């Protein structure tokens, strides 16, 4: 009494499509701000806001998940701005976002030591001890 | 320099997007049907189906161009998309199931409605190219 | 003692102010994008949807009323965005709105069949076939 | 080459009937009215309760509110406007004037009529105020 | 185990100083005050200069705003909230009244004095309102 | 020319700010611990702590710069702040109580986490400059 609409290639077009959101940023709702506080206040008063998508963050990081679930919700259809621990440089946050969007990132020899710590504190899957 | 990766990103991501269909978290669009609310009685219009912009954009060329040509430039607001009358509320929900999980079991009676709607909205995998 | 007050010319002034309302656009809180997709839009410049007001829509369209009163997720305050079926062009929706505001629109015969269909789609009083 | 007046006879009656439903309902309200109560000869300002109203009706039915909402611009879609009405206006008088602009008819107790009529003169409401 | 007690007695001084500086830097402001008038009904200057203020001081000083924010029929989560005060307060008077709540002191010309006192009375502002 | 006085301004005001320590009324920023790096088995133990922007900018050189440097270009958004790894939920509440009310009593075991946080957050009376 039923037919079945299979589609083998769904996941593959989903993979290619999502990966662009690391680059075209369309439908972004989360803006991540760095707090490294490197070399004085006046250099980056308009701090560069990293664009991100809530669902990716919740999927890849437990810390973002428990946040978006239990956090006090104020604007359900407006942007959220989040500013990350001062231990994390802006390039580190960019690498982490890339890794959360591709699952596969390259990192300079002088940023790996920090990205691992960021992932551990952000409980990003693939970077947690847990 | 170092290359950082882990074994299985797509499995967890696919599992997450799978539930996103039913946990309805983070929705950004609302889908309504002009199709007959049981006909004359007007009793039961499609109250609305909440969805996610990035999925309908990724898997439907109609919805993608809709979201590109119809910008919600305000700081806040949810897109109330009213679809053509071809799409009964059953058809809309099944097609959204398909745009999420890449699969949909379909009852025989609505086959000619869903196979139609998929081409109407050009959902990849349903639409004939 | 109990007392009574009334205004005779209330109705005419009110309705005439309403007629001008969509022209001056004051207090508009709905935007009706028109996805007519004529011959295939290559994601060109935005269609510039029509401004409208919720109270008049819901007082005229039996469908817009339900859409506005019970949307599963809603914008709490301020402008709201609707995009209409591909059946209805920007000109038709523009005429179809003026009709709901003023009760009459000098529709052209050449698009009469699109306006007449559109009324049933939005179940607009005066046009709805029921 | 030809045109037609697509028209409805009962639009005016249906619409007026669908607007008189508003003030008795919170639907689509976009302004909230307050006042110094004048509850006991000396206003009681603590217990004030906002009265939801609609810009599109106040602006047409009274001139004071029109220039208010005109010259107090809406700088954000998410902005909600509250109006602190003059102290001479009690909540009940404001309660009725909120009806008067919608229903076009009101019945009042004589003990407030002399403050409600003055309120009409202040807010420059059609029918009540001179022009 | 020890329940050691922290303090620095100059804290409240710095808190007050920061609030006083808040008055003129206007950062983190979330509520904007307008003054109702027909004066701006002419092409020369239609849009009123909306005064910025902070929610927490208004409720801290004025119980009228305290209620206006504690309970209201509708509200916004995070967007700035706009209020227009009665026509009895000119822009100078409302600015002075904001200063008084913000810092507890002010200076007024005698031609400003009466209007400021009356407006503060209606706004239930501590130190001006009599009861 | 004339002058206004309100001698009870501060005392009334101070009481009306201590109260804000308890309730979200007028809250502007949310502080989240990140302390699980300490080895805690939990997934996430914390739920965002509510705070008011202007107060933290008053007491903290770290926050006072931060809320200035975070643009919040969207006027209808709100700010979530992830505090450093070293600061637990318990310790931050003591730090905020100190920030909001000028006094806090801290257990000897958390003493070296509240005091440590003070320099990490450059909160005056705990920071060394």
Author numbering:
A (entry chain B), C (entry chain F): 4 to 133
B (entry chain A), F (entry chain C): 5 to 133
D (entry chain E), E (entry chain D): 3 to 133
Please quote the authors directly.
BTB (bric-a-brack, Tramtrack, and broad complex) is a diverse group of protein-protein interaction domains found within metazoan proteins. The Tramtrack group (TTK) is a distinct type of BTB domain, which can multimerize. TTK-type BTB domains contain a highly conserved N-terminal FxLRWN motif, where x is a hydrophilic residue. Thus, the TTK-type BTB domains are a structurally and functionally distinct group of protein domains specific to Arthropodan transcription factors.
To enhance particle contrast on cryo-EM images, we used the BTB domain of CG67651-133 fused to MBP (40 kDa), which resulted in a monomer Mw of 56 kDa. Iterative masked refinement excluding flexible MBP regions resulted in a final reconstruction of core CG67651-133 multimer at a resolution of 3.3 Å (full data processing flowchart is shown at Figure 3—figure supplement 1). The map clearly shows the hexameric assembly consisting of three dimers. CG6765 hexamer consists of three canonical BTB dimers with extensive hydrophobic molecular contacts and main-chain hydrogen bonds (N78, V82, Y84, V86) forming a β-sheet between two parallel β4-strands. In addition, a bifurcated hydrogen bond is formed from the side chain hydroxy group of Y84 of one dimer to the sidechain of T77 and main-chains of either N78 or I76 of the second dimer. Furthermore, a few inter-dimer hydrogen bonds are formed between (i) T50 and T73, (ii) N78 and N80, and (iii) side chain hydroxy group of Y36 and P75/M70 main chain atoms. Interdimeric interactions were further strengthened by hydrophobic contacts between A2 (F66, M70, P75), the loop preceding B1 (I48), and B2/B1/B3 sheet (V34, V86), with the B3 strand formed by residues highly conserved only within the TTK group. Residues with large hydrophobic or aromatic side-chains at positions corresponding to Y84 and V86 of CG6765 are characteristic for all TTK-type BTBs, whereas residues involved in stabilizing interactions at B1/A2 and adjacent loops are less conserved. The N-terminal TTK-motif is located within the first β-strand and is involved only in intra-dimer stabilization forming antiparallel beta-sheet with B4. Central part of the hexamer forms a pore, residues of loop regions surrounding the pore are not conserved, thus it is unlikely that it can possess some physiological function.
